[PDB]
Design a protein around this ligand. Structure first.
Ligand SMILES: O=S(=O)([C@@H]1C[C@@H]2O[C@H]1C(c1ccc(O)cc1)=C2c1ccc(O)cc1)N(CC(F)(F)F)c1ccc(OCCN2CCCCC2)cc1
Ligand SMILES: O=S(=O)([C@@H]1C[C@@H]2O[C@H]1C(c1ccc(O)cc1)=C2c1ccc(O)cc1)N(CC(F)(F)F)c1ccc(OCCN2CCCCC2)cc1
Ligand SMILES: [Cl-]
Lengths: 220, 235
């Protein structure tokens, strides 16, 4: 694959260029807050974000090398985790609040608390945008990989490239070899907590995009 | 803003560019006149939020009062949406790319009565930009001119501050002209070619205003209010 020959810098450049825009909530600010339904607003936002997520996924190196079926499977497994890491990233510089959108910024519940905790953890780590995009791409490629042979092999190789990229970013930033491996581990372990939150979030919803919806979106 | 170089002006404008939004996903097809109009309204309204963010980053714009910023936006918003539309559609002959998932040929334009006429005008503008090889750096200059120009001749005056406001706007406009010329000189165009291409691009602006006026006459037959615009700017 062409993707496997990308350097660290090229991988970061591709990922930064692929980033979705930050969307706004769809509601008239001239109106009182009480008119709105929180769940309604969040659903409308998420649905609009999903279209952009598909476009983003198609630009993650290696992703289009996969079958349409496997692309859908990865997206089905990752979509809420991807929405959540986006949320936490946007909320980093807003302690005690979740920036669902620039016009939908909420203070303090169980999952909300978990997301806030993740956000504060990213803030304490001084998580950089270049690291963020690597991590969100890992979520895409990893979350569904163990629930599907050449397809899996390819995915694992792209994942290894992403690891290389994360280390490269850290070496470039001035971190010692010991600091690099420690920060690599810290970042990746936070992914287990993102999985946790996603599963808890799913259990709350039960709005969820179907295999078929995702397939149609990818085809279109 | 008046201390920016041409290159800095271009950089600021490129960095300010809004995202390309999507239409309401999976609408009923075929469209009715009502459903198409509904989709276009929904799109436009979402684009407007991002336009405000963009406007606030156009050098010189925030130097104006909130009132004057709203006045400019009131006069320019549809023209700005339309030059965006024509720019997005350049590489799609015979079609208008309202959004990546809403790409319509003239046949589909006929779905709303009287619309095909303006659809044709927009297609014509888009082909004109394509034939001229309009550059992204030129596009952002032009869209910024629309913002600052369209409402400039319909402010009140009388007051010293108001005369200074208009003067400032005109100075920013002159800087944008300088920037356009700079881009052309940098590209290797002769002085005569530069002045000709400048005039061609600005004359196309009169046609964009025309199409905007025709488009506005349909919307009034949806339009963001002074209050909505002011709130968006404040937020
Ligand atoms: O965990 S949730 O259930 C779920 C995650 C988050 O909130 C919901 C949601 C969503 C996603 C898709 C959708 O269709 C609707 C909502 C989220 C989302 C949307 C867009 C995005 O960019 C990022 C996240 N949840 C947690 C809380 F907010 F409280 F912290 C929650 C629970 C009860 C509510 O009443 C409200 C929300
Ligand atoms: O180009 S438009 O002028 C403008 C484009 C699109 O439609 C408008 C619009 C919009 C904006 C806000 C909104 O809320 C709804 C729609 C558009 C927009 C939205 C987002 C965006 O990024 C770009 C554009 N246009 C479409 C085109 F002809 F070109 F195809 C158009 C032209 C003629 C019409 O009728 C004439 C006949 N009529 C006259 C009066 C009596 C009854 C008969 C009708 C529409
Ligand atoms: Cl949007």
């Amino acid at each position: 694959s062409l993707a496997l020959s990308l350097t660290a810098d090229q991988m970061v450049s591709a990922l930064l260029d692929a980033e979705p825009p930050i969307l706004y909530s769809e509601y008239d600010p001239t109106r009182p807050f009480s008119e709105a339904s929180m769940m309604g607003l969040l659903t409308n936002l998420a649905d609009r974000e999903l279209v952009h997520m598909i476009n983003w996924a198609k630009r993650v190196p290696g992703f289009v090398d996969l079958t349409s079926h496997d692309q859908v499977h990865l997206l089905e497994c990752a979509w809420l985790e991807i929405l959540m890491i986006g949320l936490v990233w946007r909320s980093m510089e807003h302690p005690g609040k979740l920036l669902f959108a620039p016009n939908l910024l909420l203070d303090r519940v169980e999952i909300f608390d978990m997301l806030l905790a993740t956000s504060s953890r990213f803030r304490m780590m001084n998580l950089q945008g270049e690291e963020f995009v690597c991590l969100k791409s890992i979520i895409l490629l990893n979350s569904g990989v163990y629930t599907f042979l050449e397809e899996k092999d390819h995915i694992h190789r792209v994942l290894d490239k992403i690891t290389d990229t994360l280390i490269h970013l850290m070496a470039k930033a001035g971190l010692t070899l010991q600091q690099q491996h420690q920060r690599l581990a810290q970042l990746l372990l936070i992914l287990s907590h993102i999985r946790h939150m996603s599963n808890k979030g799913m259990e709350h919803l039960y709005v969820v995009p179907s295999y078929d919806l995702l397939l149609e979106m990818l085809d279109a």
